[PDB]
């Protein structure tokens, strides 16, 4: 009913390749000495459905990988060769793009020193940007740290351009808006959520004349002050993470460390329209969350949104091995579909939403859920 | 030359006094008891129409109590003691409800030596006299026990026909009450049977020395009276300007003097006061066309008593704009005990909601008058960077750190919704809940709109409308709260060194400005005119300071916010570039784009013209940070002291930060100039710059402590205080041991400032010290908020690890644990966080210290149920031994078992 596999090395983070279509079936475990890649194989020999994990190889970097994200530049070809590009955060506060053929690293691009972070780096994301036609114009790496900075690292055909933006407190989570890679979301420790357009200053003002500046900080949403409608006394909680909801980034989910979560339905759930059909006739609304609740358990890692169903997210009790599945909608019906009896290190959804991958201290798991 | 007086203001609300609640009391009910909108609600409930502070000067030690009366038929009492007691902290105030409004001048205090209890006499508009016994318990313990006899009610017969006007407590059982239309009674109570009688006083002024309607006032009507001791004597002033001495032993007038003639009505204020040291001198006020004058009289007793003159006129200086009127509110008199030649007269002036305080040092020639006074009287663009956060964050900070009362925010909050019921509901909100409610209600009213071709929202318009709503709210808050700024009375407290100033919803005290204050508020000319001098580098240093001030003022709020983020980065990650690369980058990003080319040239040229400018500012910078040190005290400060110190510190630290920044800006400008002679004149300025960065750090650190709200679950104040800066204030609690005439308030401030600026190699870091104490008091959130200020010393890094550990940040904790060691700290006494490590170090004879550290870590990760790391550190302890110790070996393998088993 669920697959399990032991680990020889202590893990920190787990992520699915969803950015590359041909590699959509592999899992990376960031661990003490590098990055092990696993393959999700559909095969189950007795004659049934049921996935398994095959430990492919380990990229040795010589130091802990704490956060990690697959690039789209990841590909498979035929000796069979996995050609990988990995955006990594490492123990030395560096942000890296690691380029491999299987285990072997051809090149690491490292952001450190003066231009990098000068404290713990909490989150990282990568996004693809397309030019006039559908050509691949730029790849962008965003990172946030305890140094209260957001760093944007643009990998252009010409080379690297980077910029840093101050934050009001530590930056604990960052994510590019799905289907809109020019916007990103940043969650600060103090609960302030910021939507940021890294793009609108370079196109008109930064590169040339006539230097008429626009504010790239589009919106601040407040989290902590707006909780209590469910329902926390929460004596000084902080933000665990903030995530875009929907394949178009139409919604926003914030999770506090206390378990208190909040949802905004900002944009239309649609490829084209930004303004939601809902806004169009009931009038302009305020920026209060649309719905909120509180998880059964405090949430160290934050919410893990379902990659397909908007209303569903998973949140874990990391210390006790419980994962609660929450439907936002759906008020006060409590479901804990997974209980392990041991700590959780990290977990993520299978790229297709059928399974959850979970790293514990001694093993990695695949668990299917239906509905 | 005229010295400036400043004050420290504390709002009279539960939050500002660090109180947990209010004891609510109702006086026993009797038969004939008897008896736009939001602005009137505030005024009725929160704006006192009379107030004062009474000191029970003979107890162990003195209690100092501030009373206020409101048009909601209440009398509130707050403990405002500045001295340390042998007593539990005042965590509560008392609110006494009446069936009718207490009358103006209708509250009088007295203190009994035996039974150690304070008494309040109160008379209401309904003319009931109340005799209230105060228990110290009421201030200390929640839901305190009421003695049955706490309130006695009296209906004096003389009150039936005559209107009570002024009071003077004679004792714990005797009080005098004068009547509006003339006359004077002595009410004598027998507290042990609830009965009383009166004595008709005949104002028997046989001789005086010299050289029709039903509504009507007699010439003997008392318009001002004061009680003195140990002369059993009453001093009264009459409607027809007679200064009378009433002998209370015999109830006869012993002496009378006719004073000069002018129209005195119809403004109502005190005319008489006596000095607090030897009840022997009397100050007396004479109205004029232009502010009046003051007299002093000596009282001489042999039976017969003489009121002999000492002064005909003490003329006040000009209050500011004399085409609007100024009225005397109150005044005090203080003689200096050494002996009867030096006097001090403090005067409070009123003009609607405006106020001036004046001091006069008067002395005898066998006269000279040295005068001082108080010169008492926000915007930002939409943030384009997030260094100080966004619109709501900034406005919320500003409103809650403004020194306005909590009530004004609560009442303002009502208006921004849909109620006397609702005000009381907000009173059961915590301060954080209040903050959230304010933000929530503003954010809920502001709507975001689509724009323009329906391709996104109009983010720009949202920002502007959100800003304006916050602004309106802030204006309403300030507008309501400003009614609470009306002056009402002043009181010299001889027990402390302090003169209290009583506003309609705030208490304050007088203080001298520190140098930093003088240098902050303008202008250069007035600064120079400080005598004589008459030389550089004194003048020249001042000139350069002004250059720093004016450079600072080139920066907008938004630029300043970016600069402080850069300076924070500079002092939290000091290694990156060389010293002079950082100054250059700093100048390039923050100064150059903000400062005009001519203005740069102007600074260069005026700096070159100075003979040794670097030495000059070096010396001035030395002056500004120079502070005496008072004796550190044992033991507990009052909460009110901590609150008072914190407010003054916050105010001083802001001026320090702006000052330090100006110099940093100046140094950064200079070292980026291609002018040989300028830079030659500043050749070794790196040590000066580093010194300023260190000052900036500590100052900015403490400023972050000012708004940092602490969590709620010997030195008792440390656990009951409300802010991180009040906690800091308590740790630096200090007294002047040799001299009484200095209050623990001034000593604590000065000591705190000393701890900030007086430096050396040997000392520990102030951040580590403060954060370490917060940690010991389980203020984990505060610590975590402040963690970026802790430096790279091993103790600091170890403490970073403990804080992360407590904040469920295991991976960050472990990383910090492995980049530091306690190997050099097995003996250190100062930090109690080191005890667990040091117990292990002592057990194993301060040998194999690395292993001891790893053993300690193992046991520590174990308590927090981090069993994998607890195991690894145990294995590390085993691997790290350098010297044979069987006891240590055994203890380690013991721990390995214990840890491996728990991890599986």
**Using CB atoms, which residue from A217, A218, A319 is nearest to B865?**
A319
* Pair of tokens at residue B377: 């009287």
* Pair of tokens at residue B211: 């050289």
* CA dist., res. A110 & res. B731, Å (int): 46
Smallest Cα–Cα separation from A126: which of A172, A74, A201?
A74
DSSP letter at B319? P
* Residues pairing with B203 in the sheet: none
Greatest distance between any 2 Cα atoms in chain B: 110
Distant-in-sequence, close-in-space partners of B54: CB < 8 Å, separation ≥ 6? B64, B65, B67, B109, B118, B491
* Residues pairing with B117 in the sheet: B112
Smallest Cα–Cα separation from B169: which of B80, B76, B248, B237?
B248
Compute the residue count for chain A: 371
Distant-in-sequence, close-in-space partners of B349: CB < 8 Å, separation ≥ 6? B319, B326, B327, B328, B329, B355, B356, B357, B358, B487
* CA dist., res. B752 & res. B649, Å (int): 8
Output Rg (C-alpha) for chain B, integer angstroms: 32
* Pair of tokens at residue B594: 């903000």
Report helix, strand or coil for B768. Answer: helix
* Pair of tokens at residue A226: 């707006």
- B450/A275 touch (CB, cutoff 8 Å), yes or no: yes
Distant-in-sequence, close-in-space partners of B385: CB < 8 Å, separation ≥ 6? A165, A166, A217, B558, B561, B562
DSSP letter at B584? H
Contact A143, A117 (CB under 8 A): yes
Smallest Cα–Cα separation from B21: which of B151, B146, B140, B145?
B140
With 0-12 / 13-18 / 19 or more C-beta atoms within 10 angstroms meaning exposed / middle / buried, residue A21 is exposed
Residue numbers of B between 852 and 871 with CB closer than 8 Å to A: 865, 868
* CA dist., res. A263 & res. A266, Å (int): 9
* CA dist., res. B764 & res. B352, Å (int): 51
* Residues pairing with B334 in the sheet: B344
List, in sequence order, every beta strand (DSSP E) within A42-115: 52-60, 65-70, 75-77, 81-90, 95-101, 104-111
Q: Are strands B92-97 and B21-26 parallel, antiparallel or unpaired?
A: parallel
Same domain, B726 and B614: yes
Distant-in-sequence, close-in-space partners of B707: CB < 8 Å, separation ≥ 6? B397, B400, B401, B723
Smallest Cα–Cα separation from B416: which of B36, B15, B44, B38?
B38
DSSP letter at A267? B
Q: Are strands A159-166 and B368-373 parallel, antiparallel or unpaired?
A: unpaired
Best of A236, A321, A346 to disrupt the B interface by mutation (most B CBs within 10 Å)? A236
**Looking at chain A, which residue has its C-alpha nearest residue B442?**
A286
**Using CB atoms, which residue from A148, A213, A222 is nearest to B392?**
A222
* CA dist., res. B373 & res. B371, Å (int): 7
* CA dist., res. B612 & res. A185, Å (int): 53
* Residues pairing with B500 in the sheet: B491, B509
Same domain, B229 and B364: yes
* CA dist., res. B498 & res. B510, Å (int): 7
Distant-in-sequence, close-in-space partners of B643: CB < 8 Å, separation ≥ 6? B10, B16, B17, B18, B722, B726
Residue B630's CB: how many other CB atoms inside 10 A? 22
Helices (H), B141-269: none
Report helix, strand or coil for B370. Answer: strand
**Tally of domains in chain B:** 2
Same domain, B626 and B504: no
- Name the residue with tokens 């300025």: B685
- Name the residue with tokens 């400018």: B613
Sheet of strand B151-154, all strands in order from the earlier edge strand to the far edge: B102-112, B117-124, B129-134, B151-154
Burial track B652-668 (b if 16+ CB lie within 10 A, e otherwise): bbebbbbbbbbbbbbbb
Best of A118, A238, A284 to disrupt the B interface by mutation (most B CBs within 10 Å)? A284
* CA dist., res. A309 & res. A269, Å (int): 12
Same domain, B492 and B359: yes
Same domain, B107 and B118: yes
* CA dist., res. B674 & res. B677, Å (int): 9
Helices (H), B707-834: 724-731, 744-757, 766-776, 780-786, 794-806, 810-818
Same domain, B314 and B387: no
* CA dist., res. A72 & res. A69, Å (int): 10
Exposure of B829 in the CB half-sphere (CA atoms within 13 A): 0
The H-or-E segment that residue B581 falls in is helix B579-586
- Count the helices and strands in chain A (H runs, E runs): 1, 29
DSSP letter at B457? B
Give the Cα-Cα-Cα angle B786, B782, A219 (nearest 5 degrees). Answer: 75
* CA dist., res. B855 & res. B877, Å (int): 6
* CA dist., res. B502 & res. B488, Å (int): 6
Q: Both ends of chain A: CA-CA distance in Å? A: 15
Angle (deg, nearest 10), helices B639-670 and B597-608? 90
Contact A111, A131 (CB under 8 A): no
Q: Can the peptide bond before residue B441 be classed as cis, meaning omega within 30 degrees of 0?
A: no
The H-or-E segment that residue B618 falls in is helix B613-625
Sign of the CA dihedral with B779 first, then B784, B786, and B789 last: positive
Report how this structure was experimentally obtained. X-ray
Q: Which positions in chain B touch A277 (Cβ < 8 Å)?
A: none
Output Rg (C-alpha) for chain A, integer angstroms: 20
Report helix, strand or coil for B153. Answer: strand
Smallest Cα–Cα separation from B571: which of B779, B791, B786?
B791
Q: Which positions in chain B touch A166 (Cβ < 8 Å)?
A: 385-387, 562, 565
* CA dist., res. A187 & res. A195, Å (int): 9
* CA dist., res. B851 & res. B847, Å (int): 9
Distant-in-sequence, close-in-space partners of B11: CB < 8 Å, separation ≥ 6? B403, B404, B405, B406, B484, B505, B506
* CA dist., res. B10 & res. B521, Å (int): 22
Sign of the CA dihedral with B604 first, then B605, B608, and B613 last: negative
- Name the residue with tokens 């039974």: B115
Sheet of strand B305-309, all strands in order from the earlier edge strand to the far edge: B272-274, B281-286, B293-301, B305-309
Same domain, B14 and B53: yes
- A166/B449 touch (CB, cutoff 8 Å), yes or no: no
Same domain, B634 and B739: yes
Contact B844, B853 (CB under 8 A): no
Q: Are strands A322-327 and B499-503 parallel, antiparallel or unpaired?
A: unpaired
Q: Both ends of chain B: CA-CA distance in Å? A: 80
Domain that includes residue B507, residue range = 1-377+482-513
Contact A34, A62 (CB under 8 A): yes
With 0-12 / 13-18 / 19 or more C-beta atoms within 10 angstroms meaning exposed / middle / buried, residue A305 is buried
* CA dist., res. B457 & res. B462, Å (int): 9
* CA dist., res. B577 & res. B695, Å (int): 20
Same domain, B322 and B405: no
* CA dist., res. A113 & res. A97, Å (int): 16
Breaks (C-N over 2.5 A) in chain A follow: 78
* CA dist., res. B101 & res. B104, Å (int): 9
* CA dist., res. B751 & res. B753, Å (int): 5
* CA dist., res. B589 & res. B602, Å (int): 21
Compute the residue count for chain B: 904
CATH at residue A268: 2.130.10.10
Contact B103, B152 (CB under 8 A): no
Same domain, B276 and B404: no
- B439/A222 touch (CB, cutoff 8 Å), yes or no: yes
Phi, psi for A271 (deg, rounded to 5): -55, -35
Same domain, B422 and B358: no
Question: CB of B447 within 8 Å of any CB in chain A?
Answer: yes
Same domain, B776 and B751: yes
**Using CB atoms, which residue from A166, A220, A226 is nearest to B440?**
A226
The H-or-E segment that residue B543 falls in is helix B538-552
- B393/A120 touch (CB, cutoff 8 Å), yes or no: no
Smallest Cα–Cα separation from B164: which of B144, B151, B183?
B183
Best of B386, B561, B572, B900 to disrupt the A interface by mutation (most A CBs within 10 Å)? B386
* CA dist., res. A99 & res. A120, Å (int): 23
Angle (deg, nearest 10), helices B431-445 and B391-400? 140
- Which pairs with CB-CB distance under 8 Å and at least 24 residues apart come from B313-318? B314/B345, B314/B360, B314/B362, B314/B369, B315/B291, B316/B291, B316/B292, B316/B347, B316/B358, B316/B360, B317/B2, B317/B358, B317/B371, B317/B373, B318/B291
Which DSSP string corresponds to A12-52? Answer: EEEEE--S-STTTTEEEEEETTEEEEEEEE---TTTS---E
* CA dist., res. A317 & res. A300, Å (int): 7
Torsion angle of the four alpha carbons A47, A52, A55, A56, in this order, in degrees rounded to the nearest 10: 70
**Looking at chain A, which residue has its C-alpha nearest residue B781?**
A236
Resolution in Å, one decimal, please.
2.4
Domain that includes residue A330, residue range = 1-371
* Pair of tokens at residue B705: 């402590």
Residue B674's CB: how many other CB atoms inside 10 A? 7
Smallest Cα–Cα separation from B258: which of B210, B203, B222?
B210
The H-or-E segment that residue B11 falls in is strand B6-11
Report helix, strand or coil for B534. Answer: coil
Residue numbers of B between 733 and 772 with CB closer than 8 Å to A: none
* CA dist., res. B369 & res. B220, Å (int): 34
Question: CB of B443 within 8 Å of any CB in chain A?
Answer: yes
DSSP letter at B591? I
Tally A–B CB contacts below 8 A: 120
* CA dist., res. B372 & res. A281, Å (int): 66
**Tally of domains in chain A:** 1
Residue numbers of B between 561 and 600 with CB closer than 8 Å to A: 562, 565, 569, 572-573, 576-577
- A224/B393 touch (CB, cutoff 8 Å), yes or no: no
Q: Which positions in chain A touch B808 (Cβ < 8 Å)?
A: 257, 300
Q: Which of B473, B495, B513 is the last residue of a domain?
A: B513
* CA dist., res. A73 & res. A100, Å (int): 11
Give the Cα-Cα-Cα angle B179, B183, B188 (nearest 5 degrees). Answer: 80
């Amino acid at each position: 009913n669920q697959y399990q596999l032991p680990l020889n090395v202590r893990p920190y983070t787990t992520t699915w390749c969803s950015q590359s279509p041909s590699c959509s079936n592999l899992l990376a475990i960031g661990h003490d000495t590098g990055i092990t890649i696993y393959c999700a194989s559909e095969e189950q020999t007795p004659g049934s459905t049921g996935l398994t994990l095959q430990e492919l190889f380990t990229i040795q970097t010589g130091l802990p990988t704490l956060h990690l994200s697959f690039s789209s530049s990841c590909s498979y070809s035929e000796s069979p060769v996995y050609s990988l590009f990995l955006a990594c955060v490492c123990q030395d506060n560096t942000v890296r793009l690691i380029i491999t053929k299987n285990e072997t690293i051809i090149t690491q691009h490292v952001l450190g020193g003066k231009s990098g972070h000068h404290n713990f780096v909490n989150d990282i994301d990568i996004a693809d940007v397309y030019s006039a036609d559908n050509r691949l114009a730029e790849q962008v790496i965003a990172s946030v740290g305890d140094d209260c900075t957001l760093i944007i690292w643009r990998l252009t055909d010409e080379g690297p351009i980077l910029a840093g933006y101050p934050l009001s407190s530590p930056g604990i989570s960052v994510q590019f808006r799905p289907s809109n890679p020019n916007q990103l979301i940043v969650g600060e420790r103090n609960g302030n959520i910021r939507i940021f357009d890294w793009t609108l200053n370079l196109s008109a003002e930064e590169n040339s004349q006539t230097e008429l500046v626009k504010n790239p900080w589009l919106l601040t949403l407040n989290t902590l002050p707006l909780v209590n409608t469910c329902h926390s006394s929460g004596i000084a909680s902080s933000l665990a993470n903030v995530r875009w909801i929907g394949s178009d980034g139409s919604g926003i989910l914030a999770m506090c460390k206390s378990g208190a979560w909040l949802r905004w339905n900002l944009f239309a759930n649609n490829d084209y329209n930004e303004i939601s059909d809902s806004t169009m006739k009931l009038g302009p609304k305020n920026l209060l969350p649309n719905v909120q609740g509180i998880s059964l358990f405090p949430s160290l890692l934050g919410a893990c949104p379902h990659p397909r169903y908007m209303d569903y997210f998973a949140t874990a009790h990391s210390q006790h091995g419980l994962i609660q599945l929450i439907n936002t909608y759906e008020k006060d019906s409590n479901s804990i579909p997974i209980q392990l009896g041991m700590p959780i290190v990290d977990f993520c959804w299978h790229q297709d939403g059928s399974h959850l991958a979970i790293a514990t201290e001694g093993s990695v798991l695949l668990t299917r859920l239906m509905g | 030359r005229m010295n400036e007086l400043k004050h420290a203001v504390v709002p009279i609300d539960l939050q500002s006094f660090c109180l947990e609640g209010t004891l609510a009391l109702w006086v026993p009910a009797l038969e004939n008891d008897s008896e736009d909108d939001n602005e009137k609600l505030f005024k009725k409930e929160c704006v006192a129409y009379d107030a004062g502070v009474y000191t029970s000067n003979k107890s162990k030690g003195s209690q100092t109590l501030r009373w206020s009366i409101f048009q909601n038929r209440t009398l509130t009492i707050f403990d405002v003691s500045l001295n340390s007691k042998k007593e539990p902290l005042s965590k509560f105030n008392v609110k006494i409800h009446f069936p009718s409004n207490v009358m103006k001048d209708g509250v009088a205090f007295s203190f009994s030596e035996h039974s150690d209890t304070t008494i309040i006499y109160a008379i209401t508009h309904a003319r009931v006299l109340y005799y209230i016994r105060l228990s110290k318990t009421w201030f200390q313990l929640p839901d305190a026990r009421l003695d049955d006899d706490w309130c006695l009610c009296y209906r004096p017969i003389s009150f039936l026909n005559q209107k009570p006007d002024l009071m003077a407590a004679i004792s714990t059982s005797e009080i005098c009450v004068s009547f509006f239309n003339g006359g004077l009674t002595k009410i004598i109570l027998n507290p042990k049977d609830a009965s009383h009688y009166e004595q008709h006083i005949d104002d028997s002024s046989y001789l005086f020395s010299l050289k029709f309607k039903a509504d009507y006032r007699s010439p003997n009507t008392i318009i001002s009276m004061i009680f003195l001791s140990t002369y059993n004597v009453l001093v009264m002033l009459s409607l027809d300007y007679k200064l009378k001495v009433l002998d209370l032993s015999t109830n006869q007038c012993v002496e009378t003097i006719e004073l000069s003639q002018t129209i005195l009505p119809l403004q109502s204020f005190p005319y008489l006061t006596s000095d607090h040291t030897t009840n022997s001198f009397i100050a007396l006020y004479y109205p004029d066309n232009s502010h009046g004058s003051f007299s002093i009289y000596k009282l001489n007793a042999n039976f017969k008593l003489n009121v002999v003159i000492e002064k005909g006129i003490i003329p006040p200086s000009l209050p500011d704009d004399e085409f609007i009127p100024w009225m005397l509110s109150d005044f005090q008199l203080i003689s200096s005990e050494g002996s009867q030649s030096k006097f001090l007269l403090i005067i409070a002036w009123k003009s609607n909601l405006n106020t001036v305080i004046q001091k006069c040092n008067l002395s005898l020639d066998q006269f000279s008058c040295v005068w001082s006074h108080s010169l008492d009287s926000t915007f930002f663009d939409v943030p384009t960077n997030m260094s100080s956060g966004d619109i709501s964050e900034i406005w919320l900070q500003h409103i809650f750190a403004h020194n306005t009362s909590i009530e004004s925010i609560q009442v303002a909050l009502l208006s921004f919704q849909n109620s006397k019921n609702k005000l009381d509901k907000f009173g059961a909100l915590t301060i954080s809940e209040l903050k959230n409610a304010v933000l929530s209600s503003i954010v809920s009213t502001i709507q975001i709109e689509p724009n323009s071709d329906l391709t996104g929202y109009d983010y720009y318009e949202y920002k502007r409308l959100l800003y304006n709503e916050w602004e309106r709210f802030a204006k309403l808050v300030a507008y309501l709260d400003h009614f609470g700024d009306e002056i009402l009375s002043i009181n010299f407290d001889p027990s402390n060194a302090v003169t209290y100033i009583n506003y309609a919803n705030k208490v304050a005290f007088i203080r001298d400005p520190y140098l930093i204050e003088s240098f902050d508020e303008e202008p250069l000319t007035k600064l120079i005119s400080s005598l004589e001098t008459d030389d550089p580098s004194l003048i020249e240093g001042y000139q350069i300071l002004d250059l720093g001030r004016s450079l600072h003022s080139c920066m907008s709020f938004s630029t300043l916010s970016e600069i402080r983020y850069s300076l924070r980065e500079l002092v939290q990650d000091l290694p990156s570039y060389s010293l002079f690369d950082t100054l250059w980058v700093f100048y390039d990003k923050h100064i150059y784009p903000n400062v005009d080319p001519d203005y740069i040239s102007t600074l260069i040229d005026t700096l070159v013209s100075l003979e040794n400018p670097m030495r000059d500012i070096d010396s001035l910078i030395q002056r500004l940070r120079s502070f005496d040190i008072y004796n550190h005290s044992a033991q507990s400060p009052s909460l009110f002291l901590c609150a008072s110190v914190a407010r003054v510190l916050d105010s001083i630290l802001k001026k320090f930060q702006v000052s330090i920044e100006g110099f940093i800006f100046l140094l950064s400008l200079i070292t980026s100039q291609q002018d040989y002679e300028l830079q030659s004149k500043f050749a070794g300025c790196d040590k000066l710059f580093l010194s300023l960065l260190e000052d900036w750090r500590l100052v900015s650190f403490l400023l972050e402590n000012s708004a940092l709200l602490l969590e709620k679950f010997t030195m008792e104040a440390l656990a009951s205080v409300n802010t991180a800066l009040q906690f800091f204030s308590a740790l630096n609690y200090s007294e002047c041991f040799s001299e009484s005439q200095i209050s623990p308030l001034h000593a604590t401030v000065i000591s705190s400032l000393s701890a900030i600026f007086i430096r050396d190699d040997t000392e520990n870091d102030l951040v580590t010290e403060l954060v370490e104490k917060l940690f010991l008091f389980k203020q984990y959130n505060a610590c975590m908020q402040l963690i970026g200020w802790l430096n790279s010393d091993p103790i600091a890094v170890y403490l970073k690890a403990l804080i992360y550990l407590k904040s469920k940040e295991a991976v960050k904790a472990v990383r910090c644990f492995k980049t530091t060691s306690l190997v050099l700290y097995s003996h250190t006494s100062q930090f109690a966080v080191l005890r667990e490590f040091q117990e292990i170090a002592e057990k194993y004879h301060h040998q194999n210290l690395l292993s001891c550290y790893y053993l300690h870590l193992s046991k520590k990760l174990f308590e927090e149920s981090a069993y994998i790391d607890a195991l690894e550190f145990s294995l590390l302890a085993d691997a790290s031994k350098e010297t044979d110790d069987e006891d240590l070996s055994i203890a380690i393998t013991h721990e390995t078992l214990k840890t491996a088993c728990a991890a599986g």
